[PDB]
């Protein structure tokens, strides 16, 4: 049975909220809505996240790297009881959207920050690892600077964050250890929503560098005096070594997309290992072959069709089920347009999957002891992907509108 005080606030984006259970190693992921959906709509929506996880993302990213635990039902009093308790924990910016309190459904997943031994967990939101290559783009700046580094200017000017991050995803997504070190230092300096650190299921950093060292010193140095620089450097190196870790150097990927350059970004102040999670993530991100500029015309062709034929929306699995036939249709990587709805639709569904891979999080576990990297302790490590719900069909015009603004505003600033 469910107890209000046994669950604690863990985190949120702007689609969902997560609460971790103090005893068992599980979390519950709840949806979020404004004060202004049906119970059935939520059930399918939540079940679509599991189907998409099982039937699409386990193929692209691997069975062991993905965990999308089943949908679960709860009593409506418990959800209310929990909601009010936690309201103070939530940061004030997220509080526009309220918690899913009326449905009584949520998604139960394993807590990737918890599992007598201690545990250190680093969560990263790496963002898009390539600079767009497509001839459909009408701004030449998009071929030079990454989305992330461009986007940074508008976010700081808007007052989202205090200053521009030096993190460029192409530094992290390169194979080069020196570039990967610089990227991780840059995330440590200016965390934003791209870095978080947990110790025994407790957040300890990215919503002070010397305060981090207090917490991390027991791990890497379980007596010699070790300064902050020493502690933070070994965190950077171990993590770099976990991101360069691959268990599948030989096998052929489901997506064999080629990295069309450039591999260095201008805004940033011999490639990834074949089986590593960062490589595999980058491959599913590259399903965006056309760019939004690009893809948006093909969105209109599909919309035009669906407005003519409303019944076919369910028929063509636009909002699921995200099943084996859905997966199979993503494998047509041909970029030659034949003016057909089928072509446009294929590219639209591929673009949504790429959007999902561009906004996903990577959770790295570390525990002192299977799979082990070199360190001044002896650490057993695990890797996971988080935040793999398919991005909606309806947001594609928003991506087109936003992309224009990011590039134009950057082009003004430079
Ligand atoms: O606006 P984008 O493209 O940078 O990405 C959004 C993210 O913005 P960010 O740049 O990471 O601050 C945004 O993150 P924040 O809530 O702004 O931290 C979300 O991840 C959003 O995804 P969803 O629609 O909530 O599932 C993301 O929305 P999508 O565009 O992926 O739908
Ligand atoms: N299984 C899990 N184990 C541990 N922490 C988790 C788990 N799932 C989610 N979290 C935490 O909860 C946070 C919010 O969840 P999540 O990012 O998946 O939702 P979201 O609303 O889709 O966010 P986003 O804005 O990034 O799209 C994560 O950033 C992470 O810190
Ligand atoms: Mg997230
Ligand atoms: Mg999301
Ligand atoms: Zn960059």
Residue numbers in the entry: 5 to 40, 43 to 121, 129 to 220, 229 to 243, 249 to 295, 311 to 410, 420 to 464
What do the authors of the reporting publication say about this deposited model?
Inositol 1,3,4,5,6-pentakisphosphate 2-kinase (IP5 2-K)3 is a key enzyme of higher inositol phosphate (inositide, IP) metabolism. IP5 2-K is present in yeast to mammals and catalyzes the synthesis of phytic acid (inositol hexakisphosphate or IP6) from IP5 and ATP. Mouse IP5 2-K folds in two lobes, N- and C-terminal lobes, connected by a hinge, thereby conserving the general fold scheme of PKs and IPKs, and in a similar way, both lobes coordinate the nucleotide between them.
Unexpectedly, the formation of the ternary complex (mIP5 2-K + IP5 + ATP) was achieved by protein incubation with IP6 and ADP. The triphosphate moiety is tightly bound to the N-lobe of the enzyme through polar interactions and to the C-lobe through two magnesium ions. Residues Lys-138 and Asp-400 make direct interaction with Pγ and/or the nucleophile 2-OH. Asp-437 also coordinates a second magnesium ion (Mg2) together with Ser-402 through a water molecule. The Zn1 site is formed by residues from two CIP lobe elements: Cys-159, Cys-162, and Cys-181 from CIP-I and Cys-291 from CIP-II.
